[PDB]
């Protein structure tokens, strides 16, 4: 989905365009001519708001570069099946009807007055004859990403935008599952995404394998497809393909054959289905926090794979050429116990932080490449490029070798999660499976959400999604012996009888109404034990896991789709006590990879000054950042039992002196 959205993006800045400071603020706002061409919801949250849109679902660029949009022209008040494409100017000069306005099966307008859009920001009823154009589908103004957010007609603009932006940050899991409730624009958005193979001609599969497939065409031509397995994605995640076809099936042309990352039977699946409950629970879910059952951790429900990537090179120098070699000066045999004869780590050897990954000698010194601070995992593959074998390399290099390290991450504390309605959060605590509240039949819940954040943020759509998810999961059977209930008049005749773990889809702007949910929730199939858990309203009776006594009031439950964001915790966490020092500034390095300390802004200096704290500021400015002898002496004193000696003169001040004395300004000290 992220790749498709990036391919469909519409930038407005860059070379040949306006800058951030000069571009006006009005341009970042909507314009009544955006309907049908550029989605108004999807947009980056950062300062680049309004400058980066996205094509509409049905928009197609005319041969000149003016976006178009389909319409069917009403000739004499009768809808026309044939369609034409109109640009902005021609669209203004006509009357455009409303898709949702009821229309008879014969093409006759049941209503005499039908709302309409006019020249600019004008809408008003008009007789049912002069109307000239009518739209095609209600989903004609949404982007591709926003088109797959169920119950989009109930959320808020900001919340919908946040959810749309969140959907582009999922992480492919190990065992994906299709959502129970999602629009009908999932499989189509996956087939065109390119990351899933598909047969060209209708043939019959002879044999299949985990690494390759062989399909026999009806004309007698055998063809083979190779599927890349565990190849590092462009952004650090993994990508695979697992064929979903059996040996001896006549697969028709255009039928998916393999599922790539975030896919399940040829349709998008960015997350799993978890049983949610909405109630404040001992403040652990206080202010957007989240609680997860240990069942997720111990069942790999939300386990992901991340593949790192490193490379070292031996480039020629004036003093000589460097060569990768197993031997390395003054190193114990144990340290290099992993490197092979050629001087590289054998495949499939566990590597820990600070370990040596590939050895080389510098004309001889030691400058071998080592794992950075905070990495681990297996070594899945090593690629070595040699100039001897006639392999193109950048000028001035002889041997560039890259090593891939793959680590399996299980969801832990401090990880982000978010639904499709833009409700972020963090895993506050992962309680044991024996402590979570459980339904009356012994089914412990998997995640608990706070309730105070629902009505203030005003994203009531997710409640309806949860209700519909539970209804679909449990399966329903609406009574029809006495006849279709009035509330069930418009239901498709084939949607009255479902099975457990059924699948449902609600297209945006045209989905189940409140009456539909009210009716459905009253006819869910009973559990195998013979009893129904939830009431008509959708709430249920729980049982506290700690106290063991039931809660005084019922609570809401249901299955809600949950994704997993890319802002993991292992990347963030980092510590630094003593390590490499920069040579030009005499300050500790920066960044997690380099094992460097944190920044100390001036606002912290102001805060320290406010408290009246002086010695702490003196330390932070002199004894832990600049003073070399100060650092050495304090470290030695700490290692022993001696008191910390008072700091000295910072390097910054001495540099300032020795620099200002160069402009003939004799800067004395006057110690007296």
């Amino acid at each position: 989905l992220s790749g498709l959205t990036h391919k469909r993006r519409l930038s407005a800045l860059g070379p040949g365009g306006l800058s951030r400071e000069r571009a006006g603020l009005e341009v970042r706002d909507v314009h009544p001519s955006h309907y049908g061409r550029m989605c108004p919801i999807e947009t980056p949250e950062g300062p680049n708001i309004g400058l980066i849109g996205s094509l509409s679902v049905y928009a197609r660029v005319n041969p000149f570069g003016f976006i178009e949009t389909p319409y069917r022209k009403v000739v004499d008040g009768v809808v026309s099946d044939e369609i034409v494409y109109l640009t902005a100017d021609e669209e203004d000069r006509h009357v455009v009807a409303q898709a949702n306005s009821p229309i008879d099966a014969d093409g006759r307008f049941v209503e005499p007055r039908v709302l309409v859009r006019r020249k600019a920001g004008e809408v008003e009823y008009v007789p049912s004859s002069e109307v000239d154009y009518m739209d095609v589908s209600p989903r004609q103004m949404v982007s591709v990403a926003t088109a797959m957010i169920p119950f989009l007609e109930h959320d808020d603009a900001n919340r919908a935008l946040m959810g749309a932006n969140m959907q582009r940050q999922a992480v492919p899991l190990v065992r994906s599952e299709a959502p129970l409730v999602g629009t009908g624009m999932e499989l189509r958005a996956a087939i065109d995404a390119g990351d899933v193979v598909v047969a060209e001609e209708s043939g019959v599969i002879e044999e299949v394998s985990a690494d390759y497939i062989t399909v026999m065409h009806d004309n007698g031509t055998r063809r083979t497809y190779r599927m890349r397995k565990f190849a590092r994605s462009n952004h650090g995640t993994c990508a695979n393909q697992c064929p979903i076809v059996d040996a001896g099936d006549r697969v028709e042309a255009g039928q998916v054959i393999a599922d790539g990352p975030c896919t399940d039977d040829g349709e998008m699946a960015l997350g799993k289905n978890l049983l949610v409950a909405i109630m404040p629970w001992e403040g652990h879910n206080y202010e957007d926090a989240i609680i997860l059952s240990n069942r997720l951790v111990e069942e790999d429900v939300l386990t992901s794979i991340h593949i790192e990537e490193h490379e070292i090179d031996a480039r020629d120098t004036k003093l000589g050429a460097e060569e990768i070699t197993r031997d390395i000066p003054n190193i114990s045999d144990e340290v290099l116990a992993d490197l092979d004869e050629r001087g590289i780590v054998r495949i499939g050897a566990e590597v820990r932080d600070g370990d040596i990954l590939v050895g080389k000698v510098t004309p001889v010194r030691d400058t071998s490449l080592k794992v950075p601070h905070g990495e681990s995992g297996k070594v899945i593959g090593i690629r070595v490029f040699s100039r001897e074998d006639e392999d193109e390399l950048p000028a001035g290099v002889n041997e560039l070798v890259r090593v891939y390290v793959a680590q399996k991450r299980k969801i832990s504390d401090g990880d982000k999660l978010a639904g499709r309605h833009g409700n972020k959060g963090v895993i506050g605590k992962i309680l044991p499976v024996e402590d979570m509240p459980f339904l009356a039949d012994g089914t412990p819940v998997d995640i608990i959400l706070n309730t105070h954040g629902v009505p203030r943020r005003m994203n009531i759509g997710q409640i309806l999604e949860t209700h519909l998810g539970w209804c679909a999961h449990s399966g329903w059977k609406v009574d029809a012996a006495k006849g279709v209930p009035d509330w069930a008049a418009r239901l498709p005749d084939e949607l009255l009888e479902a099975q457990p773990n059924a699948i449902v889809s609600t297209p945006v702007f045209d989905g189940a109404q409140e009456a539909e949910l009210q009716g459905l929730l009253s006819c869910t199939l009973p559990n195998r034990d013979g009893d129904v858990l939830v009431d008509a309203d959708g709430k249920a009776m729980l049982f506290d896991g700690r106290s063991g006594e039931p809660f005084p009031y019922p609570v809401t439950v249901g299955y809600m789709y949950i994704m997993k964001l890319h802002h993991l915790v292992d990347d963030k966490i980092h510590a630094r006590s003593t390590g490499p020092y920069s040579m030009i500034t005499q300050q500790p390095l920066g960044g997690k990879a380099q094992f460097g300390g944190q920044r100390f802004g001036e606002m912290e200096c102001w805060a320290m000054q406010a408290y009246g704290a002086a010695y702490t500021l003196q330390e932070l400015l002199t004894i832990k950042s600049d003073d070399t002898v100060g650092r050495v002496k304090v470290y030695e004193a700490i290692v022993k039992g001696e008191n910390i000696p008072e700091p000295g003169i910072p390097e910054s001040f001495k540099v300032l002196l020795k620099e200002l004395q160069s402009l003939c300004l004799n800067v004395e000290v006057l110690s007296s």
């Binding site: 049905y58 389909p70 095609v136 697969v251 039977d265 040829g266 239901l491 498709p492």
Partner: peptide, 25 residues
Amino acid sequence: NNSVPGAPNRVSFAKLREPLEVPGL
């Protein structure tokens, strides 16, 4: 109306019919 040959079957709360398939994305 599953245009692709063997997509999974998931009935939908359909009320209006779109007269054209989504063009190649």
